[PDB]
Amino acid sequence: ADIQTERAYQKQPTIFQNKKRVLLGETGKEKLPRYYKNIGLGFKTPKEAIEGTYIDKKCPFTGNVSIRGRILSGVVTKMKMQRTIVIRRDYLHYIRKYNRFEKRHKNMSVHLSPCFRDVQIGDIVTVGECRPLSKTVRFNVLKVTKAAGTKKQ
């Protein structure tokens, strides 16, 4: 699909596109430069984020978001929203009186950048805390790992 599906022109604000097409610029074909950054904390930016064409202002690598605070992880539950998914974190809550634990869970809506294309329900996603992206979204998917997959039958 083409990236211009919105009413406004989708573009990366940092990159200037109209760099004075002149004789010394052999047009065509000049590829548009891509803005990207490493997000720190040892996470490597994916090659799809490096050399894709998608526009996402909330992408951790090609958007205006900084990853700071808590780095945690979850399991993909549903992928029904636009550019964002819901994940389930499973934890054990300790009840002192019975010296036993209690299986609990919480659902978190996290933003999924288009640089992660092969994301399926059940995968393990490492997410990082960012500024509030929506009413219920405060985390970005920084890493995706398959759940006993890496092959299709």
Partner: protein, 262 residues
């Protein structure tokens, strides 16, 4: 609250102030200044409880208003001025100088110093940024900022600020093997040598320090003030040399003192 608070309850006061319970309901409530109110020593309690020069807040107010209290080379008439860490307190009428340093028990001790040592003061740089016209700047652990420092000075190093000028004479790099002092947390007031620094990106860096006796502890990076080049301090250390000794070897020290005095 609809605005800032300007009262401090007596029991909610910082523990290291050593204020009792029955004397009042309120605490000094130090004014805003170079140091946070959690780790500052206001002049009212410094001159009323640590030195006993004053019996009341009115008496310490009289002493302050007669302009005898010089802090860092400047006369301060504020009764509740937050003194803070290693600011030189100078009284020229009685002719002594004080350096405000934590003891082994994490409390500000009455440390007396010579005038020639009091003429200088150590500071821990808290940030280094370049401002307009490309002018480097330097903000210390006080609110003190200076322009045009040595470019070799990096973040959380120590600088020697000579008073009455405010300029830099020398500096100590934060390096492994340098004498430091813990300025916060449980190990508050312990003198030792920087032995290791583990750094956690996105979080607090933890530095491991071994003292003279070999008791190795650790603390967060923000709670460290380098005070010497390698092992020789650049200031006068208080009694006990910042060597925290446990209650087991404190009790027999007390007993030996009682035996010697009796």
């Amino acid at each position: 609250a609809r605005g800032p608070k300007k009262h401090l309850k007596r029991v909610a006061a910082p523990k290291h102030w050593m204020l009792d319970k029955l004397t009042g309901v309120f605490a000094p409530r130090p004014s805003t200044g170079p140091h946070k109110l959690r780790e500052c020593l206001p002049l009212i309690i410094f001159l009323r409880n640590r030195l006993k020069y004053a019996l009341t807040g009115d008496e310490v107010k009289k002493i302050c208003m007669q302009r005898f209290i010089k802090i860092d080379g400047k006369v301060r008439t504020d009764i509740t001025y937050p003194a803070g860490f290693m600011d030189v307190i100078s009284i020229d009428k009685t002719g002594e100088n004080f350096r405000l340093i934590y003891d082994t028990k994490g409390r500000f001790a009455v440390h007396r110093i010579t005038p020639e040592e009091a003429k200088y003061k150590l500071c821990k740089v808290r940030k280094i940024f370049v401002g307009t016209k490309g002018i480097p700047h330097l903000v210390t652990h006080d609110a003190r900022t200076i322009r045009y420092p040595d470019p070799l000075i990096k973040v959380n190093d120590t600088i020697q600020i000579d008073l009455e000028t405010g300029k830099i004479t020398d500096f100590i790099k934060f390096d492994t093997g340098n004498l430091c002092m813990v300025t916060g947390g449980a190990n508050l007031g312990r003198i030792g040598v920087i032995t290791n620094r583990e750094r956690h990106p996105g979080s607090f860096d933890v530095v491991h320090v071994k003292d003279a006796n070999g008791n190795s502890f650790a603390t967060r990076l923000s709670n460290i003030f380098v005070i010497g080049k390698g092992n020789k301090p650049w200031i006068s250390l208080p009694r006990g040399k910042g060597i925290r000794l446990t209650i087991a070897e404190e009790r027999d020290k007390r007993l030996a003192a009682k035996q010697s005095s009796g």
